[PDB]
Amino acid sequence: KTHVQLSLPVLQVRDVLVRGFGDSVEEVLSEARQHLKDGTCGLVEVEKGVLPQLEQPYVFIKRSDAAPHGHVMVELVAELEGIQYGRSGETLGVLVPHVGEIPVAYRKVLLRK
């Protein structure tokens, strides 16, 4: 399908054990998409102090519509030293690998695949 319905667990930044997806804009995007397919991708909400606790390159999910079945449509946008690869809307959080951390919530989204 073009879009997948996912429910990502929301992790508090200081609980994340793996804090990036890779070392290049194209690997962080590829793993992110891969862990999304596998249900092993988490979501950290971006607040004051949150991004410097994480490793670049960043992968954000950003909203791309104004939202079916409760799920919000989103797309991936990487970032590395201030340059973003991907134009899209408002950031719903930063993606991270999920490796068992207990979430504080679940953000329902609809991924462009």
**Pairing outcome for strands 105-112 and 72-80:** parallel
Q: What does the block give as tokens for 79? A: 């970032």
Rounded to a whole number of angstroms, the distance between the first and last alpha carbons of the chain is: 7
Q: Where are the domains of the chain?
A: 3-112
| Residue 46, helix vs strand vs coil | coil
Experimental determination approach used: X-ray
CA distance 113 to 1: 7
CA distance 19 to 2: 28
Q: Phi and psi dihedrals of 11, rounded to 5?
A: -105, 140
CA distance 76 to 12: 20
Measured in whole angstroms, the distance separating CA 17 from the mean position of its chain's CA atoms is: 15
Domain formed by 3-112, architecture = Roll (2.30)
CA distance 10 to 106: 5
How many beta carbons lie within 10 A of that of residue 109, not counting itself? 23
Residue 75 to residues 31, 54, 99, Cα–Cα distance (Å): 14, 20, 22
